[PDB]
Symmetry: D2
Subunit: 398 residues, 4 copies
């Protein structure tokens, strides 16, 4: 009933990098425009546009989805909503789109996500008294915990994502050598994937204006060919003294956008749209904040169950790489080796980038396209989510 | 299949008023706590929490749903996500919940919303160059357009909600006397509803700490008994010189939170939960930004059609009052009189308050409760949405 | 006699966010400047330059308030102006600056003044040093103290708050809690009594405050409290050091206020029939260790007295700014004086009246001069402690 | 002859966000202060008080930079300090203040300095006056000019920028674009020539800058450019008024820098064998209409010369701060002097060298004194225009 007929993503840029000049609302518009243009489905046919965004305080404020779809030239009739389940917002957007199609409402929906961590603004508290006294803090929304709630600090901590990654490394006994090794592979597969043209179909270039002339960013600037196991081992822990998680075996902060077009099976048939995949089942689940990294475990088991499938039926697995330590802990639960041919075949977030709000849709796009070329029947896309959550979506190729 | 077994809301406070000292995440936690406590449904039974929020830049940052549920004592397994479709986010949250139950994922979901416009922080842009020069702006997130996109400015304007209200008053020729008359009714019906105890069931008191001692806020502080038709006419236009929209015939800025508990029919039967109503159909639609006030029209039409009903089958209608002018324009299309006994029976946003993010769930709460007491079969909850959108939900009493 | 004080005025002192919080510093100072000249009978065009003290010039008091204020007050464009800043003692430095110019034989008419609007002090935000930064920033409240701290500074001397330096002194001189509060109770009583008996009617000039549509006239310091009791004072908890002694009650508050004094050359005074209020005898500035800035008046007063060829015993009126009961008493310890001395802050001190930083210096000088005239005292001393370790003192001879 | 200038030093002048943007003002000024005393052979404990000029004390230069800088520089705790602010002329005002104290027979050793780091000037934010406000706020960049504008001010005189008042002057005196660019070109050539020939080696003291892990030594003003041409200068577009004449090229930039001069009493100099560089003859300050603040030097130079009992023609060396080619030339008109005058800014002016506000006053006095000594001139003049309508001048006699 819910079919994925098109998937697109802008390349992923480094923080303050290649796409730091492009504002989120404009960035997402590029994705939305490109999705529809190559699909051959008039914009006017889209019923509603769901988009994921982790921080809607800056140029992405007041419902990016609606702002972006308008900017992209869609007719005024197309609706939009911005969903926010942090790291997993991108996937939640697709889930939301699918559920609508299943409910027999619209026939054409878009599931997307965007996040410009470079341009994330500062948030400043409002005074509560007349002529205050005392310094104030300007919170950088690019980062994490802010406007902290004392009651929150008391119930669970406010440990950084990086810290929870260490908590996992401890719990599962994931050594530094293994973390860096996992990281090296992410880079190697990504570099190889680009080099061999596997990203050419799903990636749509983004024009950047540098002063007077335009530049065309058309490749993720994250992957490095010179990544070596020696250099990776030279980096210092960054979240815990005498720790194990370093800047090299964890994802960076990035800018990016992704969008997938979903239509009802009947609609696809009536317009000759060739399916890329079909949404089989979705699941969401919560885990303790201190170890939000394993969120994919219970989410994937619930999803597989709902799709009446076994992990072993999966032929391609997209597990978002928030931290090597976290990803490996998840792999432990699944009894899988980082060398598994099905796992992040073209690289993961450690090398490609983790533009929060957009990653969910980003990884589903990479999954679907790869599923098609190697004709895999079942694929999984799942991510860990900040403050203790997980989301997973099971897709069936066609 | 998707049943509404409980609905609650905190009273609505004026800007910088009775609830200005309560932070959004905490406010929403009160609603979430109350919802389950009265239901007799253990927290661990909830599958996911959807919550709407128009501005997630302050104490409501990084997914308030998840933050709120944890603060409210829910176990770590309960998931949560924050939806944002501006003014209509509250309703989008319920729709989201319903579609999940229909998809047969979980059996217990919460659809809610929160908005503390009193504590909305300031947003400051990030520097793009080394040692800048020139003044910067601190955008007040309590208001409207910010970090404006030039392209947006060119395609459609960045007129304020209040201005779009005028555009409608002009388009439909809705006089000032008519608008103020409409506003007077909102107050009278609200004052009456409270006075007669119709809000007693749906409202849960919120404790506010004033220094050392606690005070219990237990009534909306918006409605005023001394509201007169003369006073209303003495106000000056606020959005357009020689205009018609005044601070008196338009909604204010407020703080508030609301939550509705939906459960699958099979679950309700297994646990003896008595249904308040059933979710029949949902519809979302877009309209030109310059007259977003009309959003309810195409959305209500789509929803009714999807529920296979006619406007005349409706026995109670909750049309959020963003502006007298806008509501009346909507009434024009429906060929309904502001005196219709089915319309906002206990008052509307002009007198009660419009805590953005929470309004959707807020009016749904008021609808369901009134539907039950007057044994109405079909009810409609619909609202206009910023930058040109509209959402509507048809519900069947039980 | 070369530099003569011929007029002294001050606006009432308001509480933080209080009665004058609505008035901006530049405008407030203008009121003082305008009033000083109006009642003097000396045309504004006669003034040579205007010195003014201001501890924080980041907000509405930016870019030399002196000049802004004077123009606002209707002075002709020819009158010059400069804003001096020696923190807590800026107000007095302003007067000293004026006197020294008159002695140098430059102009014949100068104004020494000060202003401080602690209520409207803005926030200061650092500038980015890199392209697309990352990390939280801080908005420093200029109403307070240490900000944009320099590591090197932190290393050499601390960055202990004024309140803490008060404690350091209470400890060093063993100034008990009962003593401190007793001293504070007196400040209030003398102040309440002085107002009550009209001793402030001459030196104070009412300030019009606009509340919405109508104007209100602020004409009395809102700091002094008749209900101040030794019981209440003792019930307050230390504010700067756990198990300490300095409370919010035995320390000065944060206030808004402005004051200005008109000085002229003696030959000018004689040529225009201006009756002298007093004559500036000697000035002295001195530094002391930051951690106990409170004693600053000590070395400064000895230097000033010596320069005026006088002994402490020749003083018939002493205005010692009350930054903290503990700090004042420590100074009194050095001078071997009792807080009961009839010469000491006869009409109350900052603890009860207020300490609008930049204006305090000129504020106490104004109160000294006026009281010197009514009780016909020959020698008066005005001295204050200054933040980060300094002290200033000015000796004046009545006429 | 009671006030003698025995030593003069200045740090090089950096561009906005340039070579010294990493150094904080308080630290920058400490360099000047340390350097001044180290080469004078006068123990720090001998210094009585330290005056410093600073146009914006809202950032790292808050709460009396003089006292912070002197402590940072290692001076003993007893040395006092105060920050004076007369905007563009604060640097000079600091020396004047030092001199006047020596004349009054207070201390024997004083320091007059100035500092300004326009690169790190913070942002200033207003304080809310109501509980839960609504409406956007503004973050004023203290690097610039008018801010927290007073409506009343706007109504009496405008709030025209310095650059604008430079145009008003250009118009009033009919100073053509070609003339302005020519003046600007000479400022660069004389500056480049001066450095190249080593005339700045004596007065300039290197500033160590930390660049990550290693130190770099900034030792030359980074403003002057050898490649400055009359053709390039003419290519620039007006920056303050459409179809105007003032360009970024014929105006001074925004810069960072610090300077300090050591003044001592004549009897002290004699008793310790200090060789005088110059003698402070007379000082004068004056106000002019804000819209044409550029001419401030005229009435101030007149009053100063008159107080020194000299005639303009007796001046053998003239340092007129170059705020704007247009402003400087208008002043030159009043004096009936040609920009070719061999006495005028011999080693270059602000347009090429830089205008680090608060420090420029002391900076130009330093360059004047040193040049006076090498070419054995007897009388020199240092004068500047001051924001919002003022001017200051100081007459010095070589020795």
């Amino acid at each position: 009933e819910a079919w994925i007929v098109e998937a697109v993503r802008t390349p992923i840029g480094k923080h303050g990098g290649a796409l730091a000049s492009v504002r989120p609302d404009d960035l997402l518009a590029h994705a939305l425009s490109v999705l529809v243009d190559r699909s051959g489905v008039p914009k006017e046919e889209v019923e509603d546009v769901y988009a994921g965004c982790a921080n809607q305080a800056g140029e992405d404020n007041r419902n990016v989805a609606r702002m972006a779809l308008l900017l992209a030239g869609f007719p005024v009739e197309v609706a939009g909503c911005t969903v926010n389940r942090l790291c997993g917002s991108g996937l939640e957007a697709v889930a939301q789109a699918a559920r609508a199609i299943w409910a027999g409402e619209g026939k054409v929906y878009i599931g997307s996500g965007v996040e410009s961590m470079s341009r994330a603004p500062y948030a400043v508290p409002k005074p509560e008294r007349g002529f205050p006294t005392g310094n104030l803090v300007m919170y950088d929304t690019t980062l994490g915990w802010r406007f902290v709630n004392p009651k929150m600090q008391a119930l669970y901590g406010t440990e950084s994502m990086g810290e929870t990654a260490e908590n996992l490394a401890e719990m599962y006994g994931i050594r530094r050598e293994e973390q860096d090794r996992f990281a090296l592979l992410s880079h190697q597969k990504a570099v190889r994937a680009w080099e061999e043209g596997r990203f050419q179909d799903e990636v749509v270039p983004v024009p950047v204006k540098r002063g007077k002339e335009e530049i065309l960013v058309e490749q993720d600037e994250g992957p490095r060919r010179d990544t070596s196991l020696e250099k990776l081992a030279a980096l210092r822990p960054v979240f815990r003294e005498g720790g194990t998680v370093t800047a090299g075996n964890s994802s960076p902060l990035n800018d990016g956008a992704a969008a997938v077009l979903l239509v009802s099976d009947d609609y696809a048939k009536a317009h000759g749209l060739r399916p890329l995949a079909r949404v089989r089942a979705i699941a969401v689940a919560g885990v303790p904040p201190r170890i939000m990294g394993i969120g994919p475990v219970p989410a994937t088991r619930k999803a597989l169950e709902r799709a009446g499938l076994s992990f072993s039926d999966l032929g391609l697995i997209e597990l978002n790489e928030a931290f090597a330590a976290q990803a490996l802990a998840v792999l432990r639960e699944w009894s899988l080796s980082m060398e598994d041919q099905r796992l992040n075949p073209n690289g993961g977030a450690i090398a490609l980038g983790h533009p929060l709000g957009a990653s969910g849709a980003r990884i589903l796009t990479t999954l679907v396209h790869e599923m098609r070329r190697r004709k895999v029947q079942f694929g999984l896309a799942t991510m860990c989510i900040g403050v203790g959550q997980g989301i997973a979506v099971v897709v069936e190729g066609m």
